[PDB]
Amino acid sequence: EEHVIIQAEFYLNPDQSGEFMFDFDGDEIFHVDMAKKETVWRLEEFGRFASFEAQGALANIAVDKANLEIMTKRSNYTPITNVPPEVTVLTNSPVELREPNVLICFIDKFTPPVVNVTWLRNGKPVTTGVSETVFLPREDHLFRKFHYLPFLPSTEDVYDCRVEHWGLDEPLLKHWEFD
């Protein structure tokens, strides 16, 4: 059969934002948290099966940062062209009243890898128990990202994922309601 493993890294200025991750067939195996300098496994059990020395990622990122500065000057300071994302909202499975589920906001096909995502419940920001992935790679060198919100379904609650990005004139709002 066919499989692909990708080691994907990036550095972005002026944000001073770096990223280092491994991908298997489009799913993240791990990334390195740059602030904590530690390997973060996408599913917790992976860290009991395998290891990765996070200092190696940090060494790579320092070289990436130096090389970005070289390329910025070599290109006569040509900046990136913003490409706005496409956004989809779905749930993890068919929703049943009062049975816990998860809302997924899928942000796709964008660059640079900076994006602001807010969950709104009845128009108000919700942060209870949200989580998110890092920026995942695409073959066209754009990025993907997922944001998650656990929730207790109700006929009285409505939800929106609000996405902001330098390539969008207005925020994107994608809606979900119990059917």
Binding site: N13, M71, R74
Partner: protein
């Protein structure tokens, strides 16, 4: 504009791609340097040296190809990197199999009188390869089937949904049937008219 701080941005990405065919019988390493959205230089193990992709990458290909120890390490990386990492993760990636959860229900929208729009939801499964089909009695249905296609959830699971417009009649049974590598017999969930 939907967010502030509109200063110009400059992005540098590196991708080291290990491509595997028939287990590790054939392996191809492809290293790519990308500035903003444009790949500038690459190392392809089937070629064996760095090549510029755009004009911006020419100085790097020339410099790196002049370093013999570098080229030797890169040419051996299909073994020391690709095949090594394949082995590290094989038991929980290549061998990962998670069975789909399959449920059938009538859509809340019934857009056509005398008809019943049925939904087959298939969720939580891995890997992505799957077939989801509707049957009427013993016959596979191929008119009026709509598939949402394969959705990757970002957490090592997938889902999909397949809908069927039906005109139910007495003695008809509708079955959602799922083929997936996690099971050796198809999963089936029936709706009885």
């Amino acid at each position: 504009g939907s967010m502030g701080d509109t200063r110009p941005r400059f992005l540098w990405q590196l991708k080291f791609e290990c491509h595997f065919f028939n287990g590790t019988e054939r392996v191809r390493l492809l290293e790519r340097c990308i500035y903003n959205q444009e790949e500038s230089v690459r190392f392809d193990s089937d070629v064996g040296e760095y090549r510029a992709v755009t004009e911006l990458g020419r100085p790097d290909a020339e410099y790196w190809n002049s370093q013999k120890d570098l080229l030797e390490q890169r040419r051996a990386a299909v073994d020391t990197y690709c095949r090594h990492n394949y082995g590290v993760g094989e038991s929980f990636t290549v061998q990962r199999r998670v069975e789909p959860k399959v449920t059938v229900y009538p859509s809340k929208t019934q857009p056509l009188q005398h008809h019943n729009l049925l939904v087959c939801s298939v969720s939580g499964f891995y890997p992505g390869s799957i077939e989801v089909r509707w049957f009427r009695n013993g016959q596979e249905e191929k008119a009026g089937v709509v598939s949402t296609g394969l959705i990757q959830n970002g957490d090592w699971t997938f889902q999909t949904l397949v809908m069927l417009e039906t005109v139910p009649r007495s003695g008809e049974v509708y079955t959602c049937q799922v083929e997936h590598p996690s099971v050796t017999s198809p999963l089936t969930v029936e709706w009885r008219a």
